[model samples]
Target: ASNFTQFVLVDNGGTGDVTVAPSNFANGVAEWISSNSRSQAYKVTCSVRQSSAQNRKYTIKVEVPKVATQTVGGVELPVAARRSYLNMELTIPIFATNSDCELIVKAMQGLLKDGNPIPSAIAANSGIY
Candidate 1:
């Protein structure tokens, strides 16, 4: 697996009109695992808009995964074995003359890094290992 050690916004909020054109922009690199297990990953995106013709309105988002309940042969599958979605989003208004958005992105990284590196906490919540 290749590692992407950096994150940067392709479109910088500058002296341009921020438009809302409908398109699903996939960030980072398209990826897949050459193994038996199913693995999925994606990069977070930030959308920008002019807030009341002043500060820029930024919305960052990612589509996360979870387990969904289902049945097989009249037996319900475990929550861990099911499929689900847990999308994450962050919105903020940044003053046009300042680089506040960069700080927000860095802070978000710190928050995620502060959590458990391994999903041991998740396993405990799932009842048993």
Candidate 2:
């Protein structure tokens, strides 16, 4: 599944596609970094593992830099930023089918698109009316 030489991820803001090249593949994990910022803080990670006899686990994770700021002499000064992460994991049973998986996968996209109120909480910490 990690056969692609380069992976292109789209920006939700429509700035265009962001491409990342594989940086490492070890211990059943593949890591990618986009050259735009040239920092590990913006890396993407994918991993798969069958930890037990009856099920398999998989993960997709993305990390980004969160700019740090401080007030110094009444002026806001920016400092070194730290990495923030978002991740998704799927643990599927051995007998899962395409139809079964698709049901869950579709629900994920369904809740994240234009008409859903769930995105508002994460995007702006807004409460539901």
Which candidate's TM-score is highest? 2
Task: Give lDDT: candidate 2, residue 83.
Answer: 55
In model 1, state the lDDT of residue 115: 55
Candidate 1 lDDT over residue span 19-118, tens digit each? 2322343453222211112322223444556656545554545432222234334444343444333344454554433367668768767654525443
Cα error of candidate 2 at position 96, Å: 0.9
Residues 1-129 of candidate 2: C-alpha lDDT, one tens digit per residue = 237367665465665656678888877888887763423235788987775848878799987644322422443433344456789888888778879878988988998986579887766758877
Cα lDDT listed for each candidate: 0.40, 0.69
RMSD of 1: 12.6
- Residue 93 Cα positional deviation in candidate 1, in Å, after optimal superposition: 3.6
Q: Residue 68 of candidate 1: its Cα lDDT?
A: 27
Show the lowest summed lDDT stretch of 10 residues, model 2. Answer: 66-75
TM-score of 2: 0.71
